[PDB]
Amino acid sequence: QKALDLKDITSGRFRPENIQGVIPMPDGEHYTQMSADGTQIIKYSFRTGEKVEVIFDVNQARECDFKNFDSYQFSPDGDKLLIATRTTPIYRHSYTAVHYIYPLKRNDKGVTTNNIIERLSDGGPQQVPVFSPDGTMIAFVRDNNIFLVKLLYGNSESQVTEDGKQNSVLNGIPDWVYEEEFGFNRALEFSADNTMIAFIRFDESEVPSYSFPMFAGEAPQITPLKDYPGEYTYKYPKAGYPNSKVEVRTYDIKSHVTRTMKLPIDADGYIPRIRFTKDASKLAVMTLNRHQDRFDLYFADPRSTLCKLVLRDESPYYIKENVFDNIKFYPETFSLLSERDGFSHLYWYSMGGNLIKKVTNGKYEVKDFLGYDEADGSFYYTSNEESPLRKAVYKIDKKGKKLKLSQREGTNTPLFSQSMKYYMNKFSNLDTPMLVTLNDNTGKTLKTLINNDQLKQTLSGYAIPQKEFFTFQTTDGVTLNGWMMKPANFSTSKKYPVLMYQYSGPGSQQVLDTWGISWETYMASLGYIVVCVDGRGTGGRGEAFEKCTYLKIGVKEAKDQVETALYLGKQPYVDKDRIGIWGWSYGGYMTLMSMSEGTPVFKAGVAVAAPTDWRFYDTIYTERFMRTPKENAEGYKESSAFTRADKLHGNLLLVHGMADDNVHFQNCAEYAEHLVQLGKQFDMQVYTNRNHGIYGGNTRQHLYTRLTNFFLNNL
Amino acid sequence: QKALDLKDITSGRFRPENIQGVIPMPDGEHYTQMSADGTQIIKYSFRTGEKVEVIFDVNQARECDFKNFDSYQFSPDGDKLLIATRTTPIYRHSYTAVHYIYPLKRNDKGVTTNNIIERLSDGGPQQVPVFSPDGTMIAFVRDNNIFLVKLLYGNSESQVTEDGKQNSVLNGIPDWVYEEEFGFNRALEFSADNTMIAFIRFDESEVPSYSFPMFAGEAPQITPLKDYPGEYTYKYPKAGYPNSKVEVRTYDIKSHVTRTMKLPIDADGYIPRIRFTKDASKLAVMTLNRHQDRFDLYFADPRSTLCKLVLRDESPYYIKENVFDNIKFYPETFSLLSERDGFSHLYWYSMGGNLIKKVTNGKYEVKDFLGYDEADGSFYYTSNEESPLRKAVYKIDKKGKKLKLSQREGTNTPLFSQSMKYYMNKFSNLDTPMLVTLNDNTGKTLKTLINNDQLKQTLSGYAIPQKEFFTFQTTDGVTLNGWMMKPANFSTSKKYPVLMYQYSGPGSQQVLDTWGISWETYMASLGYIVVCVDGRGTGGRGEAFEKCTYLKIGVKEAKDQVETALYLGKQPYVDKDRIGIWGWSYGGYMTLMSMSEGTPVFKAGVAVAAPTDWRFYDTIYTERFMRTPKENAEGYKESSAFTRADKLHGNLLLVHGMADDNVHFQNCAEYAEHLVQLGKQFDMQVYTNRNHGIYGGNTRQHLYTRLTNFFLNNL
Numbered sequence A, B: 001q002k003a004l005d006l007k008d009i010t011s012g013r014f015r016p017e018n019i020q021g022v023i024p025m026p027d028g029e030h031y032t033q034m035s036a037d038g039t040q041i042i043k044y045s046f047r048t049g050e051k052v053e054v055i056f057d058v059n060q061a062r063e064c065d066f067k068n069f070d071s072y073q074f075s076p077d078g079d080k081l082l083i084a085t086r087t088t089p090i091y092r093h094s095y096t097a098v099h100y101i102y103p104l105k106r107n108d109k110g111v112t113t114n115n116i117i118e119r120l121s122d123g124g125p126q127q128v129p130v131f132s133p134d135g136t137m138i139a140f141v142r143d144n145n146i147f148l149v150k151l152l153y154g155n156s157e158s159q160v161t162e163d164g165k166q167n168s169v170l171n172g173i174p175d176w177v178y179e180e181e182f183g184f185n186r187a188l189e190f191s192a193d194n195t196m197i198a199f200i201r202f203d204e205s206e207v208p209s210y211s212f213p214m215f216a217g218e219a220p221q222i223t224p225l226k227d228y229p230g231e232y233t234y235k236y237p238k239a240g241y242p243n244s245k246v247e248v249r250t251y252d253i254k255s256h257v258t259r260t261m262k263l264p265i266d267a268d269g270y271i272p273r274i275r276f277t278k279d280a281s282k283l284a285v286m287t288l289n290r291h292q293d294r295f296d297l298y299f300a301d302p303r304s305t306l307c308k309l310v311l312r313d314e315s316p317y318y319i320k321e322n323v324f325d326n327i328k329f330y331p332e333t334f335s336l337l338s339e340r341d342g343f344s345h346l347y348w349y350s351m352g353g354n355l356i357k358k359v360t361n362g363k364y365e366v367k368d369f370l371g372y373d374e375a376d377g378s379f380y381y382t383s384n385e386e387s388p389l390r391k392a393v394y395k396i397d398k399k400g401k402k403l404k405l406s407q408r409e410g411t412n413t414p415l416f417s418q419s420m421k422y423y424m425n426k427f428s429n430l431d432t433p434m435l436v437t438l439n440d441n442t443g444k445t446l447k448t449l450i451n452n453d454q455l456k457q458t459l460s461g462y463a464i465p466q467k468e469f470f471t472f473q474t475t476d477g478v479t480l481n482g483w484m485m486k487p488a489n490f491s492t493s494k495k496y497p498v499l500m501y502q503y504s505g506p507g508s509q510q511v512l513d514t515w516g517i518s519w520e521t522y523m524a525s526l527g528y529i530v531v532c533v534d535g536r537g538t539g540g541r542g543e544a545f546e547k548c549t550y551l552k553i554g555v556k557e558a559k560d561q562v563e564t565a566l567y568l569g570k571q572p573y574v575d576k577d578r579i580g581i582w583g584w585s586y587g588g589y590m591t592l593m594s595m596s597e598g599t600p601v602f603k604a605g606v607a608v609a610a611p612t613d614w615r616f617y618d619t620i621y622t623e624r625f626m627r628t629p630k631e632n633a634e635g636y637k638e639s640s641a642f643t644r645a646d647k648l649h650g651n652l653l654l655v656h657g658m659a660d661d662n663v664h665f666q667n668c669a670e671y672a673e674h675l676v677q678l679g680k681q682f683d684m685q686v687y688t689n690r691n692h693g694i695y696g697g698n699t700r701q702h703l704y705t706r707l708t709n710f711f712l713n714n715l
């Protein structure tokens, strides 16, 4: 019966027990994980779940200068560990860290804990270090150049590129927009030979600069800025501006000759990935055109420079970013996820580019390709075949027989062993916070490592609202999925205020059979009905449902949020005059769109870190859905929150971080002044030195307290 | 009985009729004024108030390319008019304008309207043009250099200085901080000879730069910034940073030789003014030290460069800026306002520097010295001898007899004729919006030009709260003046919420017997008791009362605002739990100080454009009261709103303009983050591209609507 406390939510007091840093060892029988302390790396058996041994310990390693470590990686051989310390984030995926090599060699007592640890580099902190296939070399990036460490040669460090320059030329790591929008941090590969390095070189010299102020602030304090403010500058192309010029280069480890691949790509095209195949003489180069609807897979010869078109996959809309990391190479074959038939499905290709078979078919979506077992010819993947709200692990055999491997319905995230014999399963649903099991490739639970019983017990003493799923029919006959969360004291006799939550961005889903206690859960415990509906444009229901928004985003999503409010307003326990809506990022943009759709259904709303005109956002994301402002002028105008701002109805709170390198604070500053000149009253909360995550010290608690009080006062 | 409408207040619908651009002509019998149209300049008699003639008309002037004009100036002779068009503000006092010379020569019909108008310069817009004593030359500034126009030589334009450079060297106009804090826009003078030009040269090259973003915005839209924002940069030294290096230079009109005056000034001193005397060979140079408590008046020879100390005036606190423009030169004598005896009083000096007499004495303050009539030896000035709430015009004869010239008690602002024979009087009090009379130097009303009867009649239909003055005693026995404004329906039976308004800055006063209808008046008509009290630190009551705050500003002012709230809270018609406070500029800073003084008396407050730590503010103002941060570390800490922020009590709204070149938006951004990390909830309203005035298009209406709703919701 006690009441949830927001501070418990924001401080993560109900964060379920989990396992971090799980890496399948090459042997195929074992996995390693990080200790909770962050001070040990411990080996375990997939088959039994038994602790085999502690392989690494900060208090039991020689010349180890760090107290805790952040992350780690095994050499492909299994004899060395690359360990990262002092991890310093740059953008969402990039960071520097001081890395260390730890050899896994047994001593006189047969233990791997008393070895000596070698600083990976006597120079400065490193980016994206990667082992060569034999484990004898590590390539890394620092100051936008590539460096090579030869472990057989005294950790011999050589400099591969000399033209790296800040805000000008990047070697082996992507620029801001590629990193954010193709979702990756490394373009740096070794050949199966161990003889060649391949990398993408980004020339962003003629990409526009963007700069915003930095104040001293607090948590952290930037002390040089105590009296006079400073600034942050970086390359960021807005919609329709020029992107980096990119090319693929190779470096011959024994020769030291650098070569450029002769890739026939459009001047304004992209190279979202490179990947060495299992063939030593074949480097996969993935390329898109600027409209992002033609994916061309090339095989480049790292020595001759010759590039051969292997596959062309085309769309009347666009190719999604998630395809690229589902391309896995094997001696004679490779996988490909494609939406050609209207659903995300798995295709199996020969290494000549020749379609062997369509592995999955049906009106469901494959989410991830987990791997192929050559022993039986069988494919492992996750999908939502059960329902768009769920994900389960599946196996399809060589003849086409499908078996679902998950024991329980909800959200199943598997991490397979090297051999596909075993997998670790992390599971949740609305009622299960986390349950971690070890399973074999038939689905049998070999061991239950974590059940989160202690969490359930602690929770037992609190009065927890419960989510329930529901569907309803829009006025044009579309089924929408949503969840509804009612106070634990709910009465059909009483009428209640409503808080709608949504994200609503292309391909996204927030209606998922998974567990959480969030700020929404807290709102529900304060007496609100909290509802979340995934409108048109969201993922999991195939291409037509997702991409009906193409060239004019936000409009259809906004009507479906208005339709959701009308439907709630008809319910006898809902006070239609007290309906609020909020969201963050695309969700904040959708709050503005929805509150100014024309039907005055919302009393109040909060838009956090909201884009307000798509011309302020970046090239790769915006153009994927909208093309450029010059090709799609009317679409940009119609998708803009500015155009419909005179119909804004309800009390609005705009929240933004002033150091947002993702949705620039420009969005909020320009939109607010439009609102001022229209005579619309609204409220603001701007956060000094905060980015798109708005976090730091007491910031999140402060922010959710502000949102709580805003809806308490306006609903 | 109708209700005031805020939109009428912000659109200036009750702005009293007045007269603009009143200039006393040299003859001493006449004044000129601008038409309301802005299209005519019309001559009138002081003696009779009769219209003599229209001297200038846009529709009746030849080769006149403008529809309206902004301002105008007469040649010292009376034969030419310098007229300004296209006035473009830069800071509070500086602007560029395209000027035109119009000769006042009669035609065949005897009229001055059909003449030809000459563009003052074929080059670009000009700054601070000034006539030579004979009227044959005009000096002006453009692009930080001095130019000379010789009207007897075909409007011959020559360039006096060649080293002017933006953000580097200014000739003849002050930098940002001198302009704002010594209150002037021109350091450019001709000798009585008409033979020499003198000017101050500002070298701000080593003053720090400050930059803030500019967005496109609206009203005005900055169209180049529609996609990518820009910035504004200028020189602005914060407290304790270096000021411009300054010197006085002269240019020999016939010789073209430039010379530097040998002024013995401290390295870090100021030259707040230069002024040519009635002696052709004597240039007054006014200088302060950096502590601003030693005013040294020098007489410089423009040819020999030799400078002679004429007067030293010293203070244990500081010399106020208002003294400099009260120094008026005569053939054998000059005036000086000084606070040496503890009150602002008028002193009469010989031109050798030798005190002839103390003209005024008593425990009241002289506000302005209006002039000296040599015929009777008599002095004209304004003072508050009646009460700190009032100002009247006074005359003191050669033998010491004093006569008060004003007919009515309240606020009397006089503009004397060249000869001191007549003056124009603008008058108001709590009940008189504006009454404009013409009076002779005994006080007799010769004519009443304006009575604002129409305004009174329009007002008659509205229900107007009325101000009344009051005093009360603080707990340490100090008498404070305040005004109280109650709703027109006031009842002693009812209990009411309170809105306190204050400015509270050193030497300022808001409790004045003068007329206005403001946002406060609107709040009163919505059912609030609105109170304003001038606490310790404010002006008009002598040096001890004003400067008891020296070296630790804000603390004492804040206690007196808390004492005002306690006193109001004891009244039976005041609900002590519903007391709010607000202010703008220093008044916004005082809102924070007062709301975090420690006694939790305020329910809510609004701080507009508030300084929050004095180290963020500029050198001349801050140091006048606080010296530098390095000399007064503990004083800066104790005056800071940051230090006491943990005691903030009540709901706060912070309002700021993001392009504030005066109180940088840094103040608000740094303070808000301090509040976030302390866990204090507050509200914000930031205004894109707005300066310290926060105005533009619908901005003011939007802003006062926001303040109204904030107190309505929190009180």
Ligand SMILES: N[C@@H](CC(=O)N1CCn2c(nnc2C(F)(F)F)C1)Cc1cc(F)c(F)cc1F
Binding pocket: A180, A181, A182, A183, A184, A321, A322, A505, A585, A586, A610, A611, A621, A662, A663, A692
């Ligand atoms: N910038 C966008 C990034 C994104 O949408 N994807 C990149 C990463 N990704 C995606 N799909 N899978 C992956 C990942 F697995 F690589 F991470 C799509 C997200 C995003 C959308 C907005 F409208 C906005 F205002 C801010 C914002 F940060």
Ligand SMILES: N[C@@H](CC(=O)N1CCn2c(nnc2C(F)(F)F)C1)Cc1cc(F)c(F)cc1F
Binding pocket: B180, B181, B182, B183, B184, B321, B322, B505, B585, B586, B610, B611, B621, B662, B663, B692
């Ligand atoms: N910057 C200050 C200027 C001033 O106080 N004087 C300059 C002009 N002046 C004065 N006294 N007479 C005159 C004038 F007649 F010259 F105008 C004093 C005003 C001021 C005080 C603050 F705390 C602040 F946060 C902003 C701000 F703009």
